[PDB]
Design a protein around this ligand. Structure first.
Ligand SMILES: O=C(O)c1cc(C(=O)O)c2c(n1)C(=O)C(=O)c1cc(C(=O)O)[nH]c1-2
Ligand SMILES: [Gd+3]
Ligand SMILES: [Gd+3]
Ligand SMILES: [Gd+3]
Length: 297
């Protein structure tokens, strides 16, 4: 039995995929993991829609959209670490209002989960619509990070893993999406990033799905229990700089999901429902409610 996992080249899923393969955690679960390299999220989402993989990593809001749009997709928590709003070190910007007039890169486009969270936060706290006051530039995270470094952007909302290298190059993480959800009043760590499993794989190859889910949990557990294992996966982390490697490890470990699925489901449902309520409007990208049976039991 082969399980096809689509991965991004700048993503963190490759790290645990490499542990699964090296430690034989796929073999231990009766399957072979096939890592499918996808160039970007757009291509990954099409590979998912085209049935070219058994799973990709993605966000709960996208998963809810696919589900509302008719897909049998299932979501399993991958990480509670998400999002990084990066500004130059020494920036006068201590708040979201200070983004006014700034060239702001936003990874993933106008429907990105981190952008929906940030826009909701700025509406709730400052009654401000960031798309009206900031010069928004959408793009893939690598591009945004490079253009923030070259000075064409003044700030950028990126995937969390981009903070460490930028911190080594003159930038500071002002806020995370985790900071935003704790401001909302979330008490529990919320996984907004998860494995998205194809409905057809869940229906006809459910034990391969469960075997991969077990292999992933075992790989995350190994990384949290065996500091030596990180040095084996370092080549895949783009972390030749020592502070970058340490920061990546710290934030990955902090994001390992450690709550029961029922609690994860209730928190996701409340944050989802809260989005529009905190925003004071129907945020584009967010449905009235989560589609039914979205979470993998
Ligand atoms: O917001 C974030 O911080 C964040 C982090 C990551 C990650 O851990 O690589 C992903 C995403 N978002 C994301 O939205 C996504 O679709 C994704 C795919 C992958 C991957 O490795 O294949 N990582 C991530
Ligand atoms: Gd996605
Ligand atoms: Gd499906
Ligand atoms: Gd096992």
């Amino acid at each position: 039995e082969t399980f096809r996992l689509g991965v991004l080249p700048f993503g963190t899923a490759s790290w645990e995929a490499a542990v699964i393969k090296a430690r034989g955690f796929d073999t231990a679960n009766g399957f072979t993991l096939d890592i499918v390299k996808l160039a970007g999220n757009d291509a990954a989402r099409i590979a998912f829609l085209g049935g070219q993989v058994d799973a990709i990593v993605g966000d709960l809001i996208f998963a809810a959209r696919l589900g509302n749009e008719g897909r049998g997709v299932r979501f399993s928590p991958y990480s509670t670490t998400e999002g990084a709003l990066m500004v130059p070190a020494g920036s006068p910007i201590t708040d979201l209002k200070g983004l006014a007039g700034k060239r702001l890169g936003v990874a993933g486009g106008a429907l990105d989960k981190n952008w929906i969270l940030l826009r909701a936060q700025a509406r709730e706290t400052a009654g401000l619509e960031l798309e009206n006051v900031a010069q928004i530039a959408y793009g893939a995270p690598p591009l945004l990070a490079q253009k923030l470094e070259t000075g064409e952007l003044d700030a950028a909302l990126l995937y969390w893993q981009f903070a460490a290298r930028l911190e080594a190059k003159g930038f500071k993480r002002l806020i995370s999406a985790d900071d935003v959800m704790r401001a909302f009043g979330a008490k529990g760590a919320v996984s907004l990033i998860g494995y998205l499993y194809e409905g057809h794989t869940v229906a006809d190859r459910g034990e391969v799905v469960r075997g991969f889910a077990r292999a992933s949990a075992a790989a995350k557990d190994a990384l949290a229990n065996e500091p030596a294992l990180w040095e084996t996966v370092r080549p895949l982390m783009a972390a030749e700089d020592d502070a970058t490697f340490a920061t990546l490890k710290r934030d990955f470990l902090a994001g390992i999901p450690r709550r029961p699925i029922a609690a994860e489901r209730a928190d996701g449902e409340r944050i989802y429902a809260a989005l529009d309520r905190l925003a004071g409007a129907q945020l584009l990208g967010v449905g009235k409610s989560l589609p039914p049976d979205l979470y993998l039991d």
